[PDB]
Amino acid sequence: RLGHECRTNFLQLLLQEDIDFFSTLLRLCNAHSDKIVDSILSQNLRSCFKKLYCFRMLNAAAEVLYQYILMIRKRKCYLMVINVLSVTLTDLRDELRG
Amino acid sequence: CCNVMSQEIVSKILEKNKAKLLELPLQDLMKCTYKI
Amino acid sequence: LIEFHYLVLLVAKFLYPIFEDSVATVIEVIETKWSNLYETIIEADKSATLLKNLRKKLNFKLCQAFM
């Protein structure tokens, strides 16, 4: 990946084949890090499990995806959102209380 | 204001696609980190 | 901790030292729940707190995402 980055649809198909081992590798790459590649990845992920992968990769996209899916589960989502953010928090709290 | 800032950042990124560029540069935080 | 400030701080300290879905839920509830004696206890443990707690929570979330 890093090699070719430094034929985009080809890579899209390769990653298509990749999609558990692939996810682990991605997690590893993100940990190591801590454009085109990023966008392609985001698109493939957008194509529970989904939300998690999206969040992990983006580490705003996470929050947006979670909110969309929400639009036990509710509590978990609101909670995850609040922790990530730490207006939005107040709204989430009010919703959970309502 | 934050939205406008993000838009400006996106526009700058589009324009880029050395010293002057560095001068111009000087979730949003995550993006900045990825850029660096 | 849920049933019960100092206790919460001790718990956070223990979590930091240790550093799945149920665990995340718990961490979240704790964050939602989150004086001088507490600060003193925190200082003794270190030998700012809220920030360290938030950092730990973020780390836990990252770990859950990787899993």
Subunit contact A58:B34, Cβ cutoff 8 A: no
Contacts of C58 in chain A (CB under 8 A): 83-84
Of A56, A82, A83, the CB nearest to C65: A56
| C14-26 core/surface letters (b: 16 or more CB in 10 A; e: else) | ebeeeeeeeebeb
Measured over the CA atoms of residue C2, residue C3, residue C4 and residue C6, the dihedral's sign is negative
Minimal-distance CA residue of chain C relative to A59 = C62
Distance of CA B30 to the CA centre of its chain: 11
User: Which positions in chain C touch A79 (Cβ < 8 Å)?
Assistant: 25, 28-29, 31-32
Closest-CA distance, A39 to chain C, in angstroms, reads 19
Q: Experimentally, how was this structure solved?
A: cryo-EM
Resolution reading in Å: 23.0
Q: Which residues of chain A lie closer than 8 angstroms to B17, CB-CB?
A: 35
- Residue of chain A with shortest Cα separation from B33: A34
**Contacts of C among chains (3+ CB pairs under 8 A):** A
Tokens of C32: 């939602």
Cβ distance of A84 and C65 shorter than 8 Å: no
Question: CB of C61 within 8 A of CB of A83?
Answer: yes
Least Cα distance to B7 among B23, B33, B28, B29 occurs for B28
DSSP H/E element including A17: helix A8-18
Instruction: Please give the backbone phi and psi of residue C3, each rounded to the nearest 5 degrees, phi first.
Output: -65, -40
List, in order, residues 6 or more apart from A53 with CB less than 8 Å away.
A23, A45, C65
Cβ-Cβ contacts under 8 Å between A and B: the total is 9
Q: Which residue of C has its CA nearest to A55?
A: C65
Touching chains, A (3+ CB pairs < 8 A): B, C
A26 and A57 in contact (C-beta within 8 Å)?
A: yes
Upper half-sphere CA count for residue A60 (Cβ side, 13 Å): 8
Residue C2 and residue C25 in contact, taking contact as beta carbons nearer than 8 Å: no
Nearest to C49 by CA among C67, C36, C64: C36
